[PDB]
């Protein structure tokens with residue numbers, strides 16, 4: 001019924017496309033964060049489509065309108081494999097077009113790992129508060145063994161839900177988040193918590209070989225992805241073209257923050273992609 | 281006899297200004313053909329002078345900005361004992377004097393600051409002294425991160441006490457630019473004097489205290505392999521400044537003088553400044 005793709009595990013992934021009227025100048029894959037879905041990138045995608053980019057996305061397995069037990073994954077690499085499947089199909093239909101990646105939170109870790117798996121393949125990456133660092137209190141050998149032990153008996157045990165007020169200072173956007181039926185607001189399950197720790201460990205190992213151009217957007221008051229991880233990404237990535245923008249006092253969901261922040265975010269992505277699309 | 285530059289040119293033959301201490305500062309102007317859209321002050325680094333910003337200034341003048349500069353006291357064609365200053369604030373006071381004179385002649389125009397190394401610390405302190413006054417600041421490897429006090433009282437018995445001259449190869453990976461640096465007679469290549477090193481430590485301490493009140497928009501350009509201004513200081517400036525509009529660009533493997541680095545770096549530096557100032561000049 002709906003636009004979709006069938007992944008290597010035989011699971012249906014819901015697909016979304018924002019095709020410009022004329023010939024596309026470039027392709028851009030949108031990778032959403034944990035618990036959310038591709039429908040939340042409607043405004044960003046419309047802005048990008050207005051630059052003559054063909055925007056495409058899928059809801060990651062266990063998210064939005066895609067199949068899978070909610071916010072569970074056999075191995076974090078499944079997300080990367082599925083992005084590469086979708087990118088490869090699009091590129092076959094649009095040969096020679098440059099391909100960009102845009103990712104938020106966990107979607108940002110997926111984008112990093114996707115570009116690290118295919119060096120020199122992506123024209124650029126836009127990262128909005130990417131998941132790159134674990135809280136040191138949750139990554140100790142003791143806490144990892146405790147989580148692994150707990151995983152054996154109660155893999156679906158919830159770590160408790162977050163206070164949705166840490167997502168954005170924009171109260172209306174918090175209320176939109178809280179009433180979207182496609183968002184999973186249930187607490188992080190132990191088994192998925194371990195997969196996010198695998199994602200952070202894999203990101204850290206990938207940075208010395210990451211050469212893709214990137215734009216990194218980060219809020220200074222983000223309680224989910226600490227701003228210190230954005231500074232470490234700027235320092236450790238080997239990319240020759242890297243830009244960081246810090247939004248003072250902003251929370252996690254920068255593209256759904258206070259209008260002053262959101263307008264700047266859209267403008268900065270517009271300018272950065274536009275400058276690297278003319279280059280093609 | 282008429283007052284002359286340290287290189288014996290009468291100041292009456294050159295654009296100049298006289299600072300609050302009665303010292304002549306050599307001035308430089310790059311005025312666009314038509315009506316200027318904005319003003320931009322260029323603040324040079326320690327040991328160098330305003331003549332090294334010729335190319336950057338021509339690019340900015342091409343955006344219809346009126347570019348202006350002076351050689352800091354004790355530098356280039358200005359007066360004063362070489363690379364010595366009574367207090368670091370003298371540099372800030374003199375920038376404000378020049379900015380205030382230009383603004384009187386061009387009322388209502390937005391004013392930007394562009395600074396490299398010590399010139400960047402001057403730009404930060406200048407904007408911190410006048411909140412909401414400057415439209416923006418472009419910083420190229422600014423000086424933000426650091427018992428020579430014994431040597432300060434030992435600079436009463438040994439005034440010329442210096443730290444070793446730096447290895448010019450550390451400034452840029454571009455060998456031609458290193459050779460240009462080494463043969464410019466207006467550059468002071470002598471090692472950093474202890475009394476001046478203390479003033480640079482005062483600058484860094486004052487920059488740290490100014491950051492919680494710094495709100496000016498800024499663009500920060502920094503090389504990852506800079507041995508003079510460690511890249512760590514650029515990350516700390518991004519974190520501690522209260523500015524709502526702040527952008528950092530890191531040049532992987534680049535040295536200190538980014539605007540005179542390898543062509544791939546220099547071309548990006550010029551382009552990024554062009555785009556950043558242009559977007560804030562349209563306003």
Ligand SMILES: *C(=O)N1C[C@@H]2[C@H](C1)[C@@H]2c1ccn(-c2ccc(F)cc2)n1
Nearest residue numbers: 325326397398399423426480481508
């Ligand atoms: C920029 O204008 N610079 C002047 C030359 C290079 C950077 C060096 C410099 C600036 C500040 N300091 C300094 C030295 C020691 C110390 F403990 C603090 C500051 N050196």
Ligand SMILES: *C(=O)N1C[C@@H]2[C@H](C1)[C@H]2c1ccn(-c2ccc(F)cc2)n1
Nearest residue numbers: 033034105106107131159160188224
């Ligand atoms: C992005 O999609 N992210 C950002 C980061 C995980 C997914 C989210 C995060 C950080 C900390 N926690 C968390 C969840 C539940 C809990 F009880 C305590 C911390 N989720």
